[PDB]
Amino acid sequence: TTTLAFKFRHGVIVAADSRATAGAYIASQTVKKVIEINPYLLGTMAGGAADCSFWERLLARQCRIYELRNKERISVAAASKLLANMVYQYKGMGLSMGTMICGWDKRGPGLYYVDSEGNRISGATFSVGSGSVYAYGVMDRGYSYDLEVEQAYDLARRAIYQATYRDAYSGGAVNLYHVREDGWIRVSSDNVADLHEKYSG
Amino acid sequence: RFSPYVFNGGTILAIAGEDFAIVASDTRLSEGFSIHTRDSPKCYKLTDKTVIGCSGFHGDCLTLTKIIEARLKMYKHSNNKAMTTGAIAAMLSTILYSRRFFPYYVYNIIGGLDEEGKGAVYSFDPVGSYQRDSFKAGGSASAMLQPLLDNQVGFKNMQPLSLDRAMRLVKDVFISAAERDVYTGDALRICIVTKEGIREETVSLRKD
Amino acid sequence: SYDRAITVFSPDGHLFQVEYAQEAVKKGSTAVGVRGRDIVVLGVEKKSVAKLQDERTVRKICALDDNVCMAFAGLTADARIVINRARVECQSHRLTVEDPVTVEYITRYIASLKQRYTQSNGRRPFGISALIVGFDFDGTPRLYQTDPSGTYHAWKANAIGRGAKSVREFLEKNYTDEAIETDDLTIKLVIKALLEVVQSGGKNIELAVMRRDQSLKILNPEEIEKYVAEIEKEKEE
Amino acid sequence: GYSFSLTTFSPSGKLVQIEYALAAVAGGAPSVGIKAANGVVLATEKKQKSILYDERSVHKVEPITKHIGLVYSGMGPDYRVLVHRARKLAQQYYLVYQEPIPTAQLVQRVASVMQEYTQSGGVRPFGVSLLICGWNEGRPYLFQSDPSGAYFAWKATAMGKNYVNGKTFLEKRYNEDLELEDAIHTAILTLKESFEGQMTEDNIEVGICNEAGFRRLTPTEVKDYLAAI
Amino acid sequence: NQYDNDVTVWSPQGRIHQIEYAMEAVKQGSATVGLKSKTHAVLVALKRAQSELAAHQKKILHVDNHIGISIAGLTADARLLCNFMRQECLDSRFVFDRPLPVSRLVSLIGSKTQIPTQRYGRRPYGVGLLIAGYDDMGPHIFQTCPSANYFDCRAMSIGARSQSARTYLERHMSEFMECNLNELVKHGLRALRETLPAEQDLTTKNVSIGIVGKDLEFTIYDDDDVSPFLEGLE
Amino acid sequence: TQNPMVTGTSVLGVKFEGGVVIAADMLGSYGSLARFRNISRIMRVNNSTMLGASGDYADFQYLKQVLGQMVIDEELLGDGHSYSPRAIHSWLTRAMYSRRSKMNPLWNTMVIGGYADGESFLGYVDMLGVAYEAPSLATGYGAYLAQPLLREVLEKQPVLSQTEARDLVERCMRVLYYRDARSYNRFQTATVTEKGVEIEGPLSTETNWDIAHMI
Amino acid sequence: SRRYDSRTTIFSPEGRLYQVEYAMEAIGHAGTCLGILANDGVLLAAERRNIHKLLDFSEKIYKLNEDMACSVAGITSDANVLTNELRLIAQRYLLQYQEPIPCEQLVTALCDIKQAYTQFGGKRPFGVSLLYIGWDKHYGFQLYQSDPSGNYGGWKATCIGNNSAAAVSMLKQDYKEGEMTLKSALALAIKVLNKTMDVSKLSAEKVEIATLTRENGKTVIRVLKQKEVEQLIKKHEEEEAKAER
Amino acid sequence: GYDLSASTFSPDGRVFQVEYAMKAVENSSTAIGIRCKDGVVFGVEKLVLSKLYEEGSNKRLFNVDRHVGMAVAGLLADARSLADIAREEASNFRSNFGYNIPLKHLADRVAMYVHAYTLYSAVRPFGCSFMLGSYSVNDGAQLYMIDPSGVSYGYWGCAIGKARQAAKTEIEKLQMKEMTCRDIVKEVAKIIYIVHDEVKDKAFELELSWVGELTNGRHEIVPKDIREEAEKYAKESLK
Amino acid sequence: DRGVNTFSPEGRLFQVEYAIEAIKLGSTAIGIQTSEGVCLAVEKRITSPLMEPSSIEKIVEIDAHIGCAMSGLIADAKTLIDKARVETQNHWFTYNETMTVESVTQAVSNLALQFGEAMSRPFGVALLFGGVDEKGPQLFHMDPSGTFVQCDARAIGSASEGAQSSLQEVYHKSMTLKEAIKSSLIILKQVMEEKLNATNIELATVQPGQNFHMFTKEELEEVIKDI
């Protein structure tokens, strides 16, 4: 598993792979690891798939109830705080999950990282999963806050491809998402076996 | 000490077509190095267009299949409709996660027809996570059956499915897997779900 | 535990305990609230003033938070409980959401709490009514009013307590666009509205003022006397 | 059980069930308590309805600890409950502090128990009034407790039937320099006033408290004292 | 005067008035008829509407594949009892994996309903029920009262102005055991029609039918689907 | 029940043309001691059901008590309904599984036989809640020694008669006596048929020790 | 049983709560209690209703803390319960914060308990009214008063109990704000009590006086001896005899 | 108003709610029970209020336990509650002490349960009376009667209902201590037929049962043919 | 004095009758159902010009496809609305699909008679549910007694009698949504005491293919221009 997310002038960009394994056996290569919480929030999965899916569904229903009651949409900080408080009460039992939460609100773009141990940190560049250490290198060498849209797309695709090249539990296809002011859109889903000829030549 | 689990073997398979679905399994029940029965199928009819298959620990299979039917009747009485395949999958996910800290030791596959009349296959893990696929194999010989399906259905590494072709493919893959897997194969049960309802078939395998 | 049903329906569909709570509220000291352009003003008339009493201990304008405050009319002991519930709710909200509350949010919480006491076993209704003023994060002033039955409304100007009808009649006429263009005019309007009921002039008036980014400020008697003298000088016309 | 209070305020501010409980108490048998320089004496009348009754089957004067004693006026069945609770409270205090409970602390705890029954759901107040005697720090004590829960410290007191005349007798006769024997003589004389019939050692009960502890006089000693008087 | 406000007070004549008032609540509901033959059981219900712009209230409910009920009285109590019955049937099928017999369900209903009529500050269920079922011993028609008493019937009518239907059934009992399904349905329709005012007639809008049988699960017919049964009547 | 203590060995069962037959021995072993030698491990539930259980004996007695009271209570009503073998099989499976999940199992393996409505029933329930049905059954070491012999016969001739099933039962008991360390030479048989349930015992087997002379 | 329920905690058609007025009517019969605030201390003066000759710290003044004291009027059996609760509240605050409790927090914490009884539960309220005196680092010498309904307020001179209105009028006439000392406050208390009691002349046995003062960085709560009250009474008598001339 | 709760004594020492409950039993149809040399026989007249009810509806003879039989009168719901209570008591005894409960013990336990309802204002007394009959090889035949007050007694022949006194007058003439169950089965049907009043209670049905050594200690309903024989004998005697 | 759960001599609970009496003091709400959608219109009682009309909300959003209009004691409807919202979200969480209008109505109506001596008295609020589901536009009515029905055109409140009388002649099965809006506004104008002026009324519609929608001012004057 490797998922990354970075924040720049025109919003947030999220990228993920698609392989899921059970031991040394590859169960599937069509997993959708960017969880679509709302038309205005995005979340990722890393660690346990069941835990991420269940607790982010609970978060989605709480967000909808809040919006119904208060006639206003929830913010990214509040959503991350809710998710952090729902998993601290099962501390030590054995949950395993680490998620970025991405959105846009009154204070601009937002990108938070929450994991089951208890951390909740805001940032401008995150990567989680087994192959994250391979994506930090490329992303750090290429990242700047004044990137254009196409340049940011290219950076995310290249970072994920380089992560899957050297990691054994990472692979499949690269799924890309862009969070803007008026909601998110789905950019592309590119197969690694074609990025190989695109990049090498 | 006391161990609450045993492994009873079993293989389940599902293929989704253009306007049909197929769920197949074997009928051997084992434990350790012994054979309990040769006439124990693993497919259960949920609705006139939905079938479920379970494998793993047998007691959990029995109790889970009773719980699912009770919940379906509850839903039909409260909502005045028959439950849909997507709704069945979404409810089974929650049921499975309810036992997160003492899990069911079951592998589940759901096959049927969706609301536009096309085949649907959903696969689960013992904890609840599910996914919609096009074909899926689970149980003892999943690792042997999956590459064949990837090669023949998905056309991997090569330079529509009819019903008859799918039937032949299912029979062939179980005939091949009976050769090498210890836990698999006394008879083969096939359930075909289509517009007219659910049809059943049986085939004979090796006995040793 | 005690599980008697205290409040129940009567023929013609009335709830008598809630009506008697209304009657209890209609005997308190008058409280007037006005919503200006950049200022919100609250005023209370002191029912009894004695020279042997400390004023700091009998104030009827409290601060629920750094941006929300309220005045009440009715039974004092009930208000002392409702206020301390609202404070805890404000702190819990700021902890969980990382954002100061909205005036509507806190008035909704108070209204729900007050309504839940007219449908429970072994309880009697709260005998208080409330005016809640504040400023939202976007800078919009807010005035709300809450009823012992559990209903709340937004107002431009309002009065509760005894003699509230006369003050409402005065405000229906004297509340205009030109009368709230500056803070002095708004304060004078509040004082004049209170003067329709209070006796002995400004010696029996407590006045509080809030602005967009400042905390609640209690006006000293000298400022009240200055304003009253100016209002009396305006009678010479 | 009923969860509402059966004792409530009257439009003039009176608690009426308490007045009725004291009305019950004022119809009980007389009791006298006298505090002297060496100890305390408690006396009570023990007339019984017939000769078939066993005179020694039940007692009115009872010990709470080695140094505390009780008498009562009112209803016997309530007196028994109060005695049981007082004994349990004294034992709890001893278990905690490894020291005998002082008289004032016991009277406070018993008065608290008696007050709990005035502001509780579905119960009626006790219909008994108590006299407590004890010895602590080298000096004696004498306390009275009422059905409402209020306690007082006395020097000489009378209670029950015709207690006003008993109080007048004690006022005109009590002196602070009496020894214990003069106190016993005065107590028996006070019981003699307004007595019905001829009194013997079988129809009165006496108990004393001094340095050695609390003890209840045997009928032989009561006979000696009656002969002396 | 003072013996009629509580359910735990005996009248000097040995009666409980709150139970009688709960009985009076049932008599104000619309009529319902139930009858059986050697092979089938049938419930016929007459529905009511508040106005021409409102749909007619439901009166036949599904309890289990072999059990159905019909209602007269308070609706919410009927819903509560129906949910209790459904839960009991589900529990029986879970534990023993066979259909619950009808008489053993009626015993449970009576046992549940008797408890409120004995304790302080509680009220009887003000609903009457007709229960149609089929099991290994054949068709069954049961009738339930608010006083926790139940009866086993050959045919029975409950609701307002239901004496006329009872008289018709008493006259025509003899033919029921030999009638087939269609004639049994027509007999029930005639008995139900005996309760209508002379200016009002049966229509597909206000008639509901529920049938259970040997090789037939409990089915409900409403609206146009009751047209074949009305055809040929009279 | 974390430890078994006094235990039973094995139960055998086979179905024939018009009923079922079950067999079990009469020994309760405490470890390796062979302590109680005349105990009965076969039960008659009602006029068409019989039960035989192996494993801990205290748990078997407890289930006897519970099942007997349940049958008596359901018979008191007099409504014309009675439990079938399948209802008992399902109830036993539910009870065993419900007790497994509390981590406090009942250490038993049970064989239910019955004959109702012209159809015969032979079912198997396990300690963990594994339950199934088969034409022949054997628990414990009988699963290894006796099951091959029963299945060899049942494959060639699917439908037996009463005498053939009886004789097959004694042959299996003799083999078990030869090759099992916790066995005994006195056993007991129960047969359920259209007439009802009939228990016969104690019986015995004739052995052969000729090979002792070729050593 | 609805038949025997007395419905304590309900409103009246005029919006009143009859049990509370009945409790307040009960309080108006107890002994007079008076509190005066000065520049260097504060004092409580109470009337002794126990005057039987055979009767054997103080009768109606209790110590709650190192810095506070209180006196009650009404029904003593409930005053004991309230005092025992006040002590526990103060100890809990000290345990939590390792500092002494301020006066107003203690008064508020008790008045909450008093109001809870009047709003729900089915039981009757407490028929007692209290006067509190103490010292606090935030505000200094203070004086508070409570009611059965849960209402409190600070004062500079107050009186509760029998003949409260006459005492309040006399205090309004004679109290000089900002110019009082303990020596003058004691004389004012003696004068008001003498003008309130139903006796021809005051006596030292019928009154108890407690003074709270702050010396050497520590609070001192002192109950005056009889031979000091006798001298105070003699001084008042001489001043009154020479007052008119 | 001394008659509104079960926890109030009248100024003369009576609890009126229990008497008002007894008046409910006094308006029911009669049931009798006769104890003989080797068994007990119960007989009830069951009134039919319509021709639509099936035969065998609203049965008033219950099987509490294998060796115990019960016959009720009064409100039928209260009787059906007490039958379940008695069934639970017998089941608990068998599962705790290992053998069948003696009848004198079950009667005492049910009587204490019934009496527990006549002390509080939060519940009301039962409006039912009933008879318990049993036969044991060790204890002989036994017959007990229980009361809404909670009083339990043993009898040789008893009757409960509206026609109690006439039925007792007829039973006193039997001399039942020397004859078997077969004669008693005819005599109970005869007594039931003569105590019935057909001009006010128009129609009725006869229900009979026994427990004895002829059943080997089991409580059973009388076989049909014996029932018609007894009915014919009673009718020809009545003629 | 009597309990909360006593029957009347003619078999009715007193408290339910009193609550139904209390219903008839609220403002008039009118709902109309057509094959093109459902419309809800409600009256506002502005008691003073110093009040803000926008603070009075009597038409709420249960869900994106279900809306509710209420009358009676307004403060009591908050609990029912909260329960309805929670049940719809629970249904979506478990089954991943939208609840129907009838199921929401049953879930809300199961709370009606759950009171005793927890709630101590009935609710005394009447509700109209308007929604769009697999069967099309649907309008449901629910009252304090716990009974709910399906309607074609309903009027609740103080002037329900005359409004229903007018709806009887006005309504027909072929109405267009625009005609339904016009007719509802005409009836509301007839039954009100004040003058309809696009400020003291509230109007909402639910149509297939789009969510629950609340009319703003400009549409209100545009529609009222014809009246």
DSSP output for chain I: ---TT-B-TTS-BHHHHHHHHHHTTS--EEEEEETTEEEEEEE-----TTB-GGG---EEEEETTEEEEEEESGGGHHHHHHHHHHHHHHHHHHHSSPPPHHHHHHHHHTTTT-------S---EEEEEEEEETTEEEEEEE-TTS-EEEESEEEESTTHHHHHHHHHHH--TT--HHHHHHHHHHHHHHH-SS---SSSEEEEEE-TTS--EE--HHHHHHHHTT-
Report how far residue I221's alpha carbon sits from residue I227's, in angstroms, rounded to the nearest whole number: 10
Handedness of CA E25, E27, E31, E34 (dihedral sign): positive
Between residues 72 and 111 of chain I, which touch chain A (CB distance below 8 Å)?
Answer: 85-86, 89-90, 92-93
Residue in F1, F49, F191, F207 annotated catalytic: F1
Report how far residue I30's alpha carbon sits from residue I163's, in angstroms, rounded to the nearest whole number: 8
Phi-psi region of F167 (alpha: psi -120 to 50; beta: other; left: phi over 0): alpha
- The angle, 0 to 180 degrees and rounded to 10, between the axes of the packed helices B163-177 and B142-152 is 150
Chain B environment of I95 (Cβ under 8 Å): 87, 90-91
Three-class SS state of F177: helix
Report how far residue I144's alpha carbon sits from residue C13's, in angstroms, rounded to the nearest whole number: 12
CA nearest neighbour of G105 among G128, G80, G136, G130: G136
Six token digits for residue B127: 């904890």
Sorted by where each starts, the structural domains of chain C and their CATH numbers stand as 1-237 (3.60.20.10)
Cβ proximity of C106 and A87 under 8 Å: no
β-sheet bridge partners, residue D9: D15
Phi-psi region of A94 (alpha: psi -120 to 50; beta: other; left: phi over 0): left
Best I14, I17, I18 member to test C by mutation, with max C CBs in 10 Å, is I18
Q: Side-chain half-sphere of A131: how many Cα atoms within 13 Å?
A: 24
Total domains in the fold of chain D: 1
Six token digits for residue H188: 């109970």
Breaks (C-N over 2.5 A) in chain E follow: none
**What b/e readout covers F41-60, taking b as 16+ CB neighbours within 10 angstroms?**
bbbbbbebbbbbbbbbbebb
Tell whether A27 is in a known binding site: no
Report how far residue I170's alpha carbon sits from residue I153's, in angstroms, rounded to the nearest whole number: 10
| Bond into F202 cis (ω within 30) | yes
CA nearest neighbour of I122 among I27, I2, I13: I13
Count the neighbouring beta carbons within 10 Å of the beta carbon of residue H50: 13
β-sheet bridge partners, residue E170: none
Q: Which domain holds residue A60?
A: 1-201
Distance of CA F204 to the CA centre of its chain: 18
> Exposed (0-12), middle (13-18) or buried (19+): which is H163, by Cβ within 10 Å?
buried
Are residues H87 and F76, on separate chains, in Cβ contact within 8 Å?
A: yes
Report how far residue D67's alpha carbon sits from residue D75's, in angstroms, rounded to the nearest whole number: 25
Three-class SS state of E218: strand
Angle at E142 between CA E141 and CA E145, to 5 degrees: 150
β-sheet bridge partners, residue B111: B51, B121
The hierarchical CATH code for the domain I1-227 is: 3.60.20.10
Six token digits for residue G6: 């007395």
β-sheet bridge partners, residue B108: B54
Report how far residue A139's alpha carbon sits from residue E86's, in angstroms, rounded to the nearest whole number: 60
Residue type, E53: L
Spatial strand order in the sheet of E67-73: E60-64, E67-73, E127-135, E138-144, E150-153
Q: DSSP states of B140-189 as a string?
A: TTHHHHHHHHHHHTT-TT-----HHHHHHHHHHHHHHHTTT-TT--SEEE
Handedness of CA G114, G119, G122, G127 (dihedral sign): positive
Count the neighbouring beta carbons within 10 Å of the beta carbon of residue H193: 19
β-sheet bridge partners, residue B124: B130
Six token digits for residue F38: 């005349």
Distance of CA E86 to the CA centre of its chain: 16
Count the neighbouring beta carbons within 10 Å of the beta carbon of residue A115: 18
Three-class SS state of E221: strand
**Distant-in-sequence, close-in-space partners of H52: CB < 8 Å, separation ≥ 6:** E153, E154, E155, E156, E166, E169, E170, E173
Are residues F91 and E95, on separate chains, in Cβ contact within 8 Å?
A: yes
Token look-up 């205005």 returns: A40
Query: What is the helix (H) or strand (E) element at residue E92, kind and residue range?
Result: helix E75-95
Report how far residue I47's alpha carbon sits from residue I19's, in angstroms, rounded to the nearest whole number: 24
Report how far residue F190's alpha carbon sits from residue F43's, in angstroms, rounded to the nearest whole number: 9
Token look-up 């009447």 returns: I126
**Distant-in-sequence, close-in-space partners of D60: CB < 8 Å, separation ≥ 6:** D44, D46, D71, D72, D205
**Distant-in-sequence, close-in-space partners of D171: CB < 8 Å, separation ≥ 6:** D156, G53, G54
Q: How many G/H residue pairs have CB atoms within 8 Å? A: 3
Q: DSSP states of E180-216 as a string?
A: -HHHHHHHHHHHHHTTS-TT----TTSEEEEEEETTE
Report how far residue A161's alpha carbon sits from residue A153's, in angstroms, rounded to the nearest whole number: 12
Strands A34-35 and B21-26: unpaired
Rounding to the nearest 10 degrees, give the CA dihedral for residues B42, B47, B50, B51: 0
β-sheet bridge partners, residue D73: D129
* CA dist I7 → E17, E22, E23, I12 (Å): 10, 7, 10, 5
Cβ proximity of I104 and I131 under 8 Å: yes
Q: How many E/H residue pairs have CB atoms within 8 Å? A: 81
Six token digits for residue I148: 């709910």
Query: What is the helix (H) or strand (E) element at residue H116, kind and residue range?
Result: none
> Exposed (0-12), middle (13-18) or buried (19+): which is A44, by Cβ within 10 Å?
buried
Count the neighbouring beta carbons within 10 Å of the beta carbon of residue E205: 12
* CA dist D79 → D62, D86, D114, D130 (Å): 10, 10, 11, 8
Q: Side-chain half-sphere of I33: how many Cα atoms within 13 Å?
A: 22
**Distant-in-sequence, close-in-space partners of D98: CB < 8 Å, separation ≥ 6:** none
State phi, psi for B27 to the nearest 5 degrees.
-115, 20
Six token digits for residue I174: 């072929």
Report how far residue G105's alpha carbon sits from residue H10's, in angstroms, rounded to the nearest whole number: 55
Q: What letter would DSSP give residue A118?
A: S
Instruction: Report the structure determination method.
Output: cryo-EM
Provide long-range contacts, Cβ within 8 A and 24+ apart, for H163-171: H163/H30, H163/H195, H163/H196, H163/H197, H164/H30, H166/H195, H167/H30, H167/H32, H167/H191, H167/H195, H170/H194, H170/H195, H171/H32, H171/H34
**Distant-in-sequence, close-in-space partners of I96: CB < 8 Å, separation ≥ 6:** B86, B87, B90
β-sheet bridge partners, residue G66: none
Report how far residue G241's alpha carbon sits from residue G233's, in angstroms, rounded to the nearest whole number: 12
Q: DSSP states of A44-72 as a string?
A: E--B-HHHHHHHHHHHHHHHHHHHHHHSS
Three-class SS state of A113: strand
CA nearest neighbour of G9 among C150, D125, D1, D5: D5
Six token digits for residue H44: 């009830």
**Distant-in-sequence, close-in-space partners of I114: CB < 8 Å, separation ≥ 6:** none
Sorted by where each starts, the structural domains of chain E and their CATH numbers stand as 1-234 (3.60.20.10)
CA nearest neighbour of A24 among A173, A133, A134, A168: A168
Phi-psi region of E138 (alpha: psi -120 to 50; beta: other; left: phi over 0): left
Cβ proximity of I58 and I201 under 8 Å: no
Smallest Cα distance from G1 to chain H, Å: 8
Three-class SS state of C81: helix
Best I85, I91, I94, I211 member to test A by mutation, with max A CBs in 10 Å, is I85
Report how far residue F27's alpha carbon sits from residue H18's, in angstroms, rounded to the nearest whole number: 60
Report how far residue B145's alpha carbon sits from residue B181's, in angstroms, rounded to the nearest whole number: 11
Six token digits for residue A201: 């030549």
Judge whether C14 is closer than 8 Å to chain G, CB to CB. Answer: no
Spatial strand order in the sheet of I136-142: I59-63, I66-72, I125-133, I136-142, I148-151
Count the neighbouring beta carbons within 10 Å of the beta carbon of residue D52: 6
Handedness of CA I7, I9, I10, I16 (dihedral sign): negative
**Distant-in-sequence, close-in-space partners of D229: CB < 8 Å, separation ≥ 6:** D185, D188, D189
Count the neighbouring beta carbons within 10 Å of the beta carbon of residue C109: 16
Six token digits for residue C90: 């404000």
Note if F207 is an active site residue: no
Q: Side-chain half-sphere of F141: how many Cα atoms within 13 Å?
A: 14
State phi, psi for C173 to the nearest 5 degrees.
-95, -45
Report how far residue D163's alpha carbon sits from residue G50's, in angstroms, rounded to the nearest whole number: 18
Report how far residue A100's alpha carbon sits from residue A45's, in angstroms, rounded to the nearest whole number: 8
Cβ proximity of A111 and A126 under 8 Å: yes
Specify the CATH number for the domain of residue H232.
3.60.20.10
Report how far residue E180's alpha carbon sits from residue F47's, in angstroms, rounded to the nearest whole number: 37
Between residues 157 and 186 of chain C, which touch chain I (CB distance below 8 Å)?
Answer: 157-158, 168, 171-172, 175
**What b/e readout covers A9-32, taking b as 16+ CB neighbours within 10 angstroms?**
ebbbbbbbbbbbbeeeebbbbebe
Report how far residue C155's alpha carbon sits from residue C140's, in angstroms, rounded to the nearest whole number: 13
Query: Resolution of the coordinates in A?
Result: 2.8
Of I18, I49, I76, the CB nearest to C13: I18
Report how far residue G83's alpha carbon sits from residue G68's, in angstroms, rounded to the nearest whole number: 12
Could you tell me the CATH superfamily of domain B1-208?
A: Aminohydrolase, N-terminal nucleophile (Ntn) domain (3.60.20.10)
Helix boundaries (H) for chain G: 18-27, 76-97, 103-119, 164-174, 182-196, 226-241
Report how far residue I91's alpha carbon sits from residue A198's, in angstroms, rounded to the nearest whole number: 46
Judge whether D121 is closer than 8 Å to chain C, CB to CB. Answer: yes
Distance of CA B202 to the CA centre of its chain: 15
Are residues E96 and F90, on separate chains, in Cβ contact within 8 Å?
A: yes
**What b/e readout covers E47-86, taking b as 16+ CB neighbours within 10 angstroms?**
beeeeebbebbebbbbbbebbbbbbbbbbbbbbbbbeebb
Report how far residue H184's alpha carbon sits from residue H209's, in angstroms, rounded to the nearest whole number: 11
Report how far residue B2's alpha carbon sits from residue C148's, in angstroms, rounded to the nearest whole number: 62
> Exposed (0-12), middle (13-18) or buried (19+): which is D152, by Cβ within 10 Å?
middle
Domain definitions of chain B by residue range: 1-208
Judge whether A54 is closer than 8 Å to chain B, CB to CB. Answer: yes
Q: Which domain holds residue H181?
A: 1-237
Smallest Cα distance from G53 to chain C, Å: 38
Measured distance between the N- and C-terminal CA atoms of chain B, rounded to whole angstroms:
33
Three-class SS state of D26: coil
Sorted by where each starts, the structural domains of chain G and their CATH numbers stand as 1-245 (3.60.20.10)
